[PDB]
Amino acid sequence: APDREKALELAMAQIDKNFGKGSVMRLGEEVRQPISVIPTGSISLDVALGIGGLPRGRVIEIYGPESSGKTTVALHAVANAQAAGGIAAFIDAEHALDPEYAKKLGVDTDSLLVSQPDTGEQALEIADMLVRSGALDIIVIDSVAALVPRAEIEGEMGDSHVGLQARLMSQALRKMTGALNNSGTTAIFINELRETTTGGKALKFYASVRLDVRRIETLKDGTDAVGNRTRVKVVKNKVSPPFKQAEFDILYGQGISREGSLIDMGVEHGFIRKSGSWFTYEGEQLGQGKENARKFLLENTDVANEIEKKIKEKLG
């Protein structure tokens, strides 16, 4: 009577129907559920996500240490959402945003809604209000940690000092998610590990995607610095197989390096052959030094473009 796979598929189907698609899934699985997404500004990451970018109408958490690249991504995320004629909002509770850089990554600052809330409740409330207007494609909340409850903000005693911030953040997501789904706005929560940042307790369970952003190498060329390579691990992903990983370059004052992405993916995917200490494409001389190569590619815009075209085909 028992046929494992058949029995299994029925179970899994039941699971997914009872709790939504993605509740459970094989890791090697390949997703045809294409969704609607916001390109991450990182090709590798986009692929790592399995859907080509951040799912829309979903809660995303982008945690990691300072200077790990979190913001940059979130910023790109915005720019792309905007290029697609979308409306974007930035709930700032860190007062760090450098709009000049944002424009650099291609954000239309002038049309960017910003808010700098007096408390945690307010910050979350303002966002919820904005969200249920469904006019937003994306909305980024800087510093899950900076969402300090009002009672704490207003000088309040070490008495009845409940673990309120986590509570604050939970109730908030509980109600905000439902709307987010309806609105179809992606909500990126930037969470810096300095639960995860206290509010990240519920965020862990409310996110459909969770990116572990980490800095891994200083990008150097010769005896100097040009940028830093970042690695992002998609620890959680309720819309595709999780645990995938991606790396990419972010040069000083520059966002995610396209040519960089190209040079990396192109290699691991053959299209560009890297003999140790020289890169070559279709017999072409790209250069010695991932940088000389990046240079080459950024200059010969024609090349790379056929290799972004090639790579893109082979994947998605």
Domain residues for the domain of 48 are 25-256
Beta carbons of 14 and 220 less than 8 angstroms apart? no
3-state secondary structure 99-124: HHHHHHCCCCHHHCEEECCCCHHHHH
250 shares its domain with 261: no
- Integer Cα distance of 196 and 308 in angstroms: 37
Chain breaks in the chain (C to N over 2.5 A) after: 194
Cα dihedral: 9, 15, 19, 24 (round 10): -60
- Integer Cα distance of 258 and 12 in angstroms: 39
Tokens found for residue 231: 């690695």
Local structure of 11: helix, strand or coil = helix
Q: How many domains does the chain have?
A: 2
Q: What are phi and psi of 104, to 5 degrees?
A: -50, -50
According to the entry, how was the structure determined? X-ray
67 shares its domain with 198: yes
Q: Which of 251, 269, 250 is nearest to 309 (CA)?
A: 269
CATH of the domain at 85: 3.40.50.300
- Integer Cα distance of 137 and 184 in angstroms: 7
Tokens found for residue 108: 């239309």
- Integer Cα distance of 36 and 29 in angstroms: 19
150 shares its domain with 282: no
Hey, which residues does 189 pair with through a beta bridge?
A: 61, 141
Hey, which residues does 59 pair with through a beta bridge?
A: 187
CATH of the domain at 294: 3.30.250.10
223 shares its domain with 285: no
Tokens found for residue 245: 């990983």
- Integer Cα distance of 102 and 6 in angstroms: 51
In the chain, DSSP assigns E strands to: 37-38, 54-55, 59-64, 87-91, 113-115, 136-141, 186-192, 209-219, 227-237, 245-251, 272-275, 278-281, 284-287
Residue 190: inside a domain, yes or no? Answer: yes
Phi-psi region of 79 (alpha: psi -120 to 50; beta: other; left: phi over 0): alpha
150 shares its domain with 286: no
Residue 8: inside a domain, yes or no? Answer: no
Based on C-alpha coordinates, what's the Rg of the chain?
A: 21
Q: How far is CA 87 from CA 29, 114, 137, 175, in A?
A: 34, 12, 6, 21
Hey, which residues does 192 pair with through a beta bridge?
A: 64
Resolution in A: 3.0
Beta carbons of 180 and 187 less than 8 angstroms apart? yes
Token match 């890297």: residue?
Answer: 274
- Integer Cα distance of 271 and 302 in angstroms: 15
